[PDB]
Design a protein around this ligand. Structure first.
Ligand SMILES: Cc1ncc(COP(=O)(O)O)c(/C=N/[C@@H](CCCNC(=N)N)C(=O)O)c1O
Ligand SMILES: N=C(N)NC[C@@H](O)CC(=O)C(=O)O
Lengths: 369, 367
């Protein structure tokens, strides 16, 4: 009855032991609370300055924070959207003007698949081993108009390394295909902080990148998706963007600027340390527990997959929910073959440690019948 | 090209009277809310979002007379904007509906979002929509009838008896009735209970409410997508493909601005818009060839008609004096020449830059 992962996440939104959706719900740091305390000042600034200047500063702060020095800073090359999913809707509807089929990494967050399919695009799954380990086949590239990679991936944390991004961008250029990247989880893993725009521009392929500020910091879902596109993209992303919105709030852009600056001043290292700590408490707690394993040993992402033998993720979810703990079954990340995820749940790590600890102790007991 | 692309040219300019968003100064009661934003933040971290959301919806719907709205969780879908609501609706229509009857003129992204999602449009002129039943031929040929009320740019309000009849006609033809009520807060004639009428007629229906145009909240807002239990369209599914929900801080802000409005802010807003409308009309009163096509509009946008000049020529001349209005062609999404001789002026502005802007227009029109 839960048609997608988001509908599983609705069930958790009002519980103290929500470890389902990937949004950041941990406490603000002291430096971040100082930003919140200055919100009336940021409001006045947002009333008094031209939005283009605030937007330019927010983009500069965020892209430079994460190593993306080559981003196109000319006004209009980075489209600020209400969310990365709104960017994805724009991209999907734009793709459907001239593309029939999209090669898409599998598993990935399911609304990428569902927005693409919903706009009439046929999807070809590319498993992670194929995507990272070998060139894509000429047969595949000639049959699709776009290759879409989430990196770091959700739910696996896998990062497309620079050499492979380069080869993929070269392949797309050679075939005329759009390379599209979703880099929502970029901030969590320094392996994703090499300059992606430099690679893409040097390869000369048609490209689109959707950045997202929404997953890094606990900003009560105040965020923007940033839809960045090559000059030759050849899709009507600018026109469809303008059908949907005039722009985002200057106050949100100012918040993104301030949170990015705090992150540059040591907040980002603290975040990495915090996620590492929370991953450690989860793995320590599901220690022995016969039948339990962690499919993504090297992930640095803010979500964590847990696998179990002889139990189903939906079953674990129901036993968990009877104790008011809400996680996420993994089936629907495997948008082309949901049974691939039948024996996994996903746990959200962007949480205060104490509620996370309590939820994982509950899972330890459950997983011990 | 669309109206939004004209609006981008004005966005960083002092004499922007183009887009309809609210850009006047906060009232003192509203500035008090902004001063307490750190408290609203703490509330949003601590309380379940469902409680804040229910309170925001209750405050906003009751403020505007919509007491029969479906208050069960999940019947009102909070979206980042009304245009996001409209994208969800357009996409949800496109599998089962080929043709939509749409009020003409209206704001052009309604037409562009519908067309962009594969729907063919059939214009319905305002005098026909309000003045008489729709024909059986039209209603049997369309899967949805879409009415903006109060309309943008005309301010025209669908009266209760005509809404009732339209909903009855849509029910008897199996047609979805969709309303965009984004400008509801401005005109008390739109504060009779629309949900009572829709539920009583028993057609399949969708209403898109919008908080964005009423208050100067730096574009912090929600579109509210409300639907009948039997709508038969994938609005809930496609909504969930796009978002988990809106920020609890924005919902708390809507609740507080709605409460301020219920305490007298809404009366003050109506008096403020009436004052700015009076400024425009007094300023242009005696100019040769100018008329006001919508004398009873209470909307926050104002149409100005002039003979012997195209709204495009007038826009061009204003732009040289750094004033940005809107040519009206593109609101007439089926027949753009219908709007060749009008421009639209935004009234949700501090009175001082509005007066400065209207003074340029007066002198441009007099010379
Ligand atoms: C009747 C009606 N229904 C919905 C909306 C969307 O409101 P939103 O912008 O989503 O908050 C509007 C917008 N009216 C403004 C701003 C247009 C901004 N451009 C795009 N949205 N593409 C205007 O008339 O200038 C409307 O009139
Ligand atoms: N439909 C949407 N946008 N659902 C939100 C989810 C957030 C996410 O991506 C995650 O929980 O990992």
């Amino acid at each position: 009855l839960k048609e997608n992962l988001t509908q599983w996440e609705y069930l958790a939104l009002n519980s103290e032991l929500n470890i389902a959706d990937g949004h950041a719900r941990q406490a603000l740091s002291p430096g971040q609370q100082k930003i919140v305390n200055e919100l009336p000042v940021l409001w006045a600034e947002s009333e008094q300055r031209p939005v283009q200047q605030i937007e330019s500063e927010a983009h500069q702060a965020y892209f430079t924070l994460l190593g993306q020095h080559g981003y196109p800073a000319e006004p209009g090359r980075v489209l600020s959207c209400y969310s990365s999913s709104v960017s994805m809707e724009i991209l999907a509807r734009s793709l459907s003007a001239s593309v029939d089929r999209v090669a898409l990494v599998h598993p990935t967050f399911d609304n990428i698949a569902d927005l693409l399919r919903g706009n009439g695009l046929d999807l070809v799954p590319v498993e992670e081993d194929a995507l990272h380990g070998a060139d894509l086949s000429a047969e595949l590239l000639s049959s699709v108009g776009c290759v879409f990679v989430t990196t770091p991936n959700n739910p696996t944390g896998r990062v497309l390394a620079e050499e492979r991004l380069r080869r993929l961008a070269e392949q797309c250029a050679e075939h005329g295909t759009v390379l599209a990247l979703d880099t929502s989880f970029r901030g969590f893993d320094a392996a994703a902080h090499y300059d992606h725009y430099a690679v893409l521009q040097e390869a000369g392929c048609r490209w689109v990148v959707i950045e997202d500020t929404g997953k890094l910091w606990p900003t009560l879902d105040l965020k923007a998706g940033l839809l960045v596109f090559s000059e030759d993209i050849g899709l009507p992303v600018e026109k469809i963007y303008s059908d949907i919105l005039l722009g985002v709030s200057p106050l949100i852009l100012a918040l993104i600027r301030e949170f990015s600056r705090d992150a540059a001043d040591g907040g980002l290292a603290d975040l990495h340390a915090f996620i590492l700590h929370n991953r450690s408490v989860v793995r320590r707690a599901l220690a022995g527990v016969e039948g339990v394993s962690f499919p993504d040993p090297e992930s640095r992402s803010s979500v964590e997959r847990v696998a179990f033998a002889g139990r189903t993720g939906t079953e674990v979810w129901e036993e968990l929910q009877r104790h008011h703990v809400f996680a996420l079954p993994c089936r629907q990340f495997h948008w082309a073959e949901p049974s691939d995820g039948d024996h996994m749940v996903r746990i959200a790590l962007s949480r205060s440690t104490e509620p996370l600890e309590k939820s994982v102790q509950v899972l330890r007991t459950v997983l011990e019948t």
